[PDB]
Design a protein around this ligand. Structure first.
Ligand SMILES: *[C@@H]1O[C@H](CO)[C@@H](O)[C@H](O)[C@H]1NC(C)=O
Lengths: 48, 49
């Protein structure tokens, strides 16, 4: 029995990951934050 | 010149870098382009459009 539950359990994770783009919320955030800071850091150049 | 660090000056627009022929297709009235960072990225040779 347990094999089926486990093996089936994995399958959901694929699809729980395949479509829900909000699954990787944390990682995508960190890259987002750093990218923004650089923009702000770069954009400050054009200020008198 | 091309492909060498130089101090280019375009119609009064200056800067430093390497100049190569681009691939971007401006609209004819568009003079010169830029980047997300407002930084100069593209130029149009005024004498060589
Ligand atoms: C002046 O510039 C135009 C357009 O860039 C060019 O066609 C023309 O030949 C230039 N003058 C000379 C003598 O080449």
């Amino acid at each position: 029995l347990i094999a089926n539950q486990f093996n089936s359990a994995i399958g959901k994770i694929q699809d729980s990951l395949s479509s829900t783009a909000s699954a990787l919320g944390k990682l995508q955030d960190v890259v987002n934050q750093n990218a923004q800071a650089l923009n702000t850091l770069v954009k400050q150049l054009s200020s008198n | 010149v091309k492909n060498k660090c130089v101090n280019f000056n375009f119609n009064g627009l200056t800067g430093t870098g390497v100049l190569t022929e681009s691939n971007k297709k401006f609209l004819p009235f568009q003079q010169f382009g830029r980047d997300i960072a407002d930084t100069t990225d593209a130029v149009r040779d005024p004498q060589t459009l």
